[PDB]
């Protein structure tokens, strides 16, 4: 598990919213 393979959404979504 990473979070620097989901805050790569954590941050994409977390951008969109």
Request: charged share 40%; aromatic share 12%; glycine share 0%.
């Amino acid at each position: 598990e990473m979070r620097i393979s989901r805050i790569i959404l954590x941050f994409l979504f977390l951008r969109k919213k």
